[PDB]
């Protein structure tokens, strides 16, 4: 499906500021 979906957990979640 998507491997960015792993990468997802890394970008937007560092935006939990």
UniProtKB/Swiss-Prot annotation:
Superkingdom, according to UniProt?
A: Bacteria
Q: Where in the cell is it found?
A: Secreted
What functional role does this protein have? Acts as a pheromone, induces cells to develop competence for genetic transformation.
Q: Which family does it belong to?
A: Belongs to the ComC family.
Q: What is this protein called?
A: Competence-stimulating peptide type 1
Q: Which gene encodes it?
A: comC1
């Amino acid at each position: 499906e998507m491997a960015l979906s792993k990468f997802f957990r890394d970008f937007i979640l560092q935006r939990k500021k």
